[PDB]
Amino acid sequence: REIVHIQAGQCGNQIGAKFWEVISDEHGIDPTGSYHGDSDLQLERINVYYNEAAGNKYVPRAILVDLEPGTMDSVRSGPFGQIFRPDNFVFGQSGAGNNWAKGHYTEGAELVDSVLDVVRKESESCDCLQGFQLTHSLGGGTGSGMGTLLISKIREEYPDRIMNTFSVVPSPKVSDTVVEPYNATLSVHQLVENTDETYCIDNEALYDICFRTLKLTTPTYGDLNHLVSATMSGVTTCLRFPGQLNADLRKLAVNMVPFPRLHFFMPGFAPLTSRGSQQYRALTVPELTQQMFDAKNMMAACDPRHGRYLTVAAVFRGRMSMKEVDEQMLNVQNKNSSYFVEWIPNNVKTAVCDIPPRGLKMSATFIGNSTAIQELFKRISEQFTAMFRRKAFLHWYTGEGMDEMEFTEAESNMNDLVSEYQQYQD
Amino acid sequence: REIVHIQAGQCGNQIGAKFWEVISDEHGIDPTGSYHGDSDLQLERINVYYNEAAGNKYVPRAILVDLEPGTMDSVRSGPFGQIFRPDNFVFGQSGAGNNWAKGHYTEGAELVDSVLDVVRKESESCDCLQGFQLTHSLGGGTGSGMGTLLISKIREEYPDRIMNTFSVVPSPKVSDTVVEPYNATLSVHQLVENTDETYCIDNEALYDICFRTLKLTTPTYGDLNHLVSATMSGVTTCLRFPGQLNADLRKLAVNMVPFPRLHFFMPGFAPLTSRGSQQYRALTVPELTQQMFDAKNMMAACDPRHGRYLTVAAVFRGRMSMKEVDEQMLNVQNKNSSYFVEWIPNNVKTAVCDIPPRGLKMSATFIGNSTAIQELFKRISEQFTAMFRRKAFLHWYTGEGMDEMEFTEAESNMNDLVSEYQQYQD
Amino acid sequence: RECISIHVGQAGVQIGNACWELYCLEHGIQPDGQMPDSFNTFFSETGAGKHVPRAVFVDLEPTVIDEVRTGTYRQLFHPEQLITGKEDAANNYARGHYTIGKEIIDLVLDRIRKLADQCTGLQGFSVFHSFGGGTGSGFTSLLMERLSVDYGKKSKLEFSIYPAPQVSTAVVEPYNSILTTHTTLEHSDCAFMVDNEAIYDICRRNLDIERPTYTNLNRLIGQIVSSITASLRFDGALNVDLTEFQTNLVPYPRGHFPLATYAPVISAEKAYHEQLSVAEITNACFEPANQMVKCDPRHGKYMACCLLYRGDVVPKDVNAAIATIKTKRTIQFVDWCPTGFKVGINYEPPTVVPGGDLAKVQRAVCMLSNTTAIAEAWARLDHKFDLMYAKRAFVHWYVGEGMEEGEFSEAREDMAALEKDYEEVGVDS
Amino acid sequence: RECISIHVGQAGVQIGNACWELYCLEHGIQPDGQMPDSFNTFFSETGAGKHVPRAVFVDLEPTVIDEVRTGTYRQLFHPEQLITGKEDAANNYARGHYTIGKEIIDLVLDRIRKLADQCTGLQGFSVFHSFGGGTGSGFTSLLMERLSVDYGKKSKLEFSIYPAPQVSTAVVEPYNSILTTHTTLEHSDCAFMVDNEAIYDICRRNLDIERPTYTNLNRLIGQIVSSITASLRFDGALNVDLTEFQTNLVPYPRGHFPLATYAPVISAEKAYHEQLSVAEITNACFEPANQMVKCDPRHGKYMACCLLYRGDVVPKDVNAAIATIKTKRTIQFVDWCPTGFKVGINYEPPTVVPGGDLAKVQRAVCMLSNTTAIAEAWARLDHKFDLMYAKRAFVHWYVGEGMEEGEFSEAREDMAALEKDYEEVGVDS
Ligand SMILES: Nc1nc2c(ncn2[C@@H]2O[C@H](COP(=O)(O)OP(=O)(O)OP(=O)(O)O)[C@@H](O)[C@H]2O)c(=O)[nH]1
């Protein structure tokens, strides 16, 4: 099987560097080097993310889409930056304006064809394609607009292969932009109707989870990114490993989406202990479920405790008892019968790889489909209206060839999306 | 079986360091080290006080509650201070004011939830829980107030598991504080109605017993503490050892409490001879009962000779004849028929471990439930009224959100408690 | 005379590697194929030195069949006989049966037609699948399906590992197991059942170990199974052919599912203790804590048991130990059944792994049977299904895989009459 | 033929380890189980080279049963037969009988039904408990309780260690012993009694040692008991079956409690002194300072004695030594009883611990009997009870454990008619 990553925008891009920083080491691939793999198993399934050309050069099969040179020229001028074949860099030296409209209708719409071109060169690579990974932020141009287009096109070209989306939904407390809800509401819209698996991460849900669950005092972006990339590795790549009970994107999809919206999840990693001290090793297993299922530790902003779950997928990856795994999951399902929805006898989807995260003994990625994420699109949707009402920075959109009915559309859509999700919380 | 110690306040804390200083050696556990145990028996039952994580790191399962950093930061910065998992330290950097009200209603009430949290993490450790050990002083904030709360909550969470309380009731002659009877009367109140086994120690009953029963001329606190910790080791931990006739918290409880008040005891150690010289070894056994049952040597302030007993528990721990033990106890019960209450044919509860205190040949902890302790709550209760009458330092309580009926309550309650206890002395 | 075997699904393959291990182990045929008819009903004497297996392996992910061609035994099978579909497994019936699984079937069949020819008057195919899987439920469904037509004139005993009563794995499991039952029902001869969870109990209660690797449960079935084919197709004082089973074991056309049970499960380290009596093991067979199935005889009246013994056993010992049982009454057998005790006696005692955790006695009882008990197990597994179907849960995963509201709803109704069937054939006189 | 044994309560277990020790010691079976029918009525020949015990062990704290599985003998029992309830002991009847003790009972029974089956026509269960305990009083209460119903057709001889007359331990003791008596009374066949204190006297006065470890009293009962089962179930010149006892020993249905007594108690170091005459030991039996019970024949008229002899003894010597006694009158036997002397003669002399403190003679007399004497012992123990009950003392400890004002008050009335019973059956003509 296979997949083809997609680094839309700067963020989605910045993260690319971290997702690939990791993944590679979790596959023994040095900058341009080959497979130094401490083992021999980190190779029989690599294909999922690379391509064979030389014999020591397995190049990441991702796409780097962005209308701001400097960015990709920071990712390509640093560490692992020199492993991507230049063909991968689909830049847009234009003005990468922070407008969803500027990267979806006017500026991005041009650079698109020169992207799809490659997304096809990579898809028609070889063997059988599974789906595409998509990273980006719903709070900018090259991210929400142009990346949200990249998919609307992808999903017309292969409505068969899957589409996981890793979105950095606009953090609450403080937004890293001003129109944010504009660029956001507009991209979520496109999401709820193309990709079929979305993993929403919040820069501040991370800080928290990174400053209190990792006594880490100076959580640089690199970190946040790093933590995130840690989860997306547990998801995909991982399951493309052996296991007593293994799954793969689809299983994950076909066990997690009760209703076609596409629904968004909230990823959570397992061993998340501070370096030295904490290295408690309390990782027998009840310790991992202890972790994963708590409020804090959910990369999302919202707290599960604020709304039932529809599905859950503990994708563990480290030798354990299909008994102490299958078992724990249960008590968990009974101690919290309250929030776990009922019309699904077994919400949880236990998954079990074998080999764990390179240096760790036992981990377990969590992919939750809780109704709690209602209380986020609400947020976003609110911010919109409060500012849409006055058409705040709307001239930067319309003046870019947009529509007063376009914004209406998205909000509503994504706004209805909130509605539905409640239809199950009850 | 198991238990989870609780170091409430500074005192209760300071003592923690001594109770664990000891106990560990009585279980071969070096600072962070493991079981160096001279034997193999000091391990089959440790669980009662530790937890398995590494394989050399059996960490004490206690709680360190205090609103004054410096304290726990003296216990954690000294000797065995680096054995407690940091998670154990439930500090309250607030102003640990010397007000019962400041650590029970206003300041402590906040830090409570972050405590109960852990008291549950430790309780739900493993196997089966027996009860919790509680150390503190009834003459301060973090001690009487906040610690007296910790239990009122504990006893709502597991009205099944037991609750031994080690209280440092306000010594007579001189009070190491001023409101003392305020912080005290208020905590005894909470005690008579939650914990079901209390061992009251008096800093001056110790001095005495430590300056004349140990020619010790400079009895530092460390000492007093050390002596106390010596008794609480004979009690618990001890009985969690084999024995011709062994008991355990409950036996101790179910043989010592005739009436539900909870009743408070007065612990007494056996071989209490000065170092060099005195090392008379007159410890055949009549020498231990000689000891234990005399006035002086009762960690309490009051003197047994001033009031009958309801129950007694000579918890011996050193190879002896179930005959010379069971026998002695008798004469003792007949030479003093006067004070030993009659409606209990056999007041005494002979208990007999096997292995003795590490370096000693034969010892025997004494846990007396004498009616004499009436003449102490009297004391306390007096001090209250004499100062309550004028509302002395009451503004420091009320001004902290208290009630003029709260103080009334406690005194009465604890005051009635004096009454009852006399109902048997007669 | 022989009986081919098709191990389908990762599990059916893991269990396969296991049952396949125990084999050579008690036939002196090192992993290199060479030993230094009898057992020819499971091994073909190919070339002039080896003993190429007599089965096949079908998984849609390579991972699991791959491991076989790494670890000694690598030498045992023919590079050919281990079928794979590099594609995708998918923990969903539909995809495995219809959509994907389809592509491979032909090829699959080809071997069970190429391996079925080479032999000499065979008796059937011992199929190994894991009810609640993708490649195990779906695929087989049509494999057994295509068999019942290509060789209706044989035995189709499928050895299944049906859904743990509370400790299932896949989120959908029931979807996959209500579907493998309805499609295979009208195609199997006798379906043996071994409950994954109810086997753990045996590992906890009758062997003591909270460290049971899948590799163990496999050693176990790997045992109970050895008692079925291996030794039985092997000479003895009371031989029992495969046909024998279905005949003496199924009262009615529903591919009836008996339960597998073993007698001597005792842990090495106990290995020295004085052995158990012919009477004890016999009795152990009527204990609902030793049957590789969470179908505790909660009421289910037995209706036929095939007591396969092996090792040193005196026919009178049996024709007495059983007599004692026939009169325990609390073991209530069906009405319409006077005597339902097929006594199968073999010679060669069992053969325990050199150093696993199995005692190693000199006699055992692998008794299997049809018990009105499964009235439960099916019930409890059917109910599951509804709950989810009631909301369509992961339905879009199958529909989009060449299935319909039909196959589900119409396979539900199917089992419905399996809850009535297993009810009528019993509980009534 | 055999007689299972259930050692309940730490004590009943310590005494058990002891009585169990003396056993192999005089049967040439090292702690490894191996020796290089007869005695089969207490040991099952598991195969095989071993001699797995023929009893069980029940304590609610692990401490005491744990020590058995440390010290040689560790090899003797089956890892299984030593039942434990990690939970809590509690020196209170209620909790041990009702509340906690309940949970274990099933399991307990299971063994005395699993061990009771394996044998060949048994005779009963020698129960070992310590009247005034938690696990010993309560638990058994219902153990013997559940036995009297599951095997009413057998012998229920319970060997108790009833409350030291002045040197009790537990503060409640009587609560626990007035309760084990009333609940077991209507269930036992013959209850043997050995007074812990009155045994010390023997260690002070008839052996000299103020250093008597529990491990000694145990060696003693461990002796008197060996004279009961062990040797008796062992061939001899005048065999005496277990039934024999209750028949020749109980005049009335009350699970009547005789007293155990031994003749030759003389300390090693005396070991060389010229041995005692058949007449002396016989006479020693009528001395109220050698009877393992503080029930000095203060008036209690014997009503039946079972003089079990062992070693070199001429039947005439006995049928004379006893004659002399029958005419001492100051030994007054009941009226309604002409002759109440069951002479039990065994062959093999006693067998003293290699180097404990027991003399080691070539003949002994373990005479047990029902004496109107206990009219006392019960009295003095009943009175105790009242005093406390009169104030409810530790009552809240039982109530809160599934008991009521009923069970106490109604078990008091019980024994009341045990003070009248042991009074009426004697003192009157
Ligand atoms: N006894 C036993 N049961 C197993 C073993 N492997 C898996 N199982 C059980 O069989 C089921 C798992 O099926 P999967 O491994 O998910 O799937 P599969 O049937 O191999 O086919 P796919 O879904 O397409 O991968 C679960 O109920 C497991 O508990 C094994 O080695 N032994």
Ligand SMILES: Nc1nc2c(ncn2[C@@H]2O[C@H](COP(=O)(O)OP(=O)(O)OP(=O)(O)O)[C@@H](O)[C@H]2O)c(=O)[nH]1
């Ligand atoms: N002869 C003899 N008497 C013993 C021995 N151990 C204890 N006893 C006596 O039996 C009684 C003690 O019972 P405990 O040990 O307290 O309790 P238990 O009956 O084992 O059961 P629990 O109360 O639940 O622990 C006392 O009267 C002791 O004097 C022993 O080894 N030998």
Ligand SMILES: Nc1nc2c(ncn2[C@@H]2O[C@H](COP(=O)(O)OP(=O)(O)O)[C@@H](O)[C@H]2O)c(=O)[nH]1
């Ligand atoms: N986790 C994370 N968030 C990022 C990174 N870079 C920008 N963001 C977030 O992305 C949003 C801004 O969008 P941006 O990526 O600049 O848009 P674009 O570059 O015009 O497509 C803010 O909410 C930031 O917190 C990053 O490297 N990691």
Ligand SMILES: Nc1nc2c(ncn2[C@@H]2O[C@H](COP(=O)(O)OP(=O)(O)O)[C@@H](O)[C@H]2O)c(=O)[nH]1
């Ligand atoms: N034995 C003993 N008493 C102590 C110790 N520390 C303080 N005390 C006593 O505790 C009382 C004072 O309360 P304190 O512990 O300061 O209260 P808190 O710290 O505000 O909770 C005085 O009666 C002291 O004698 C100690 O280490 N050992």
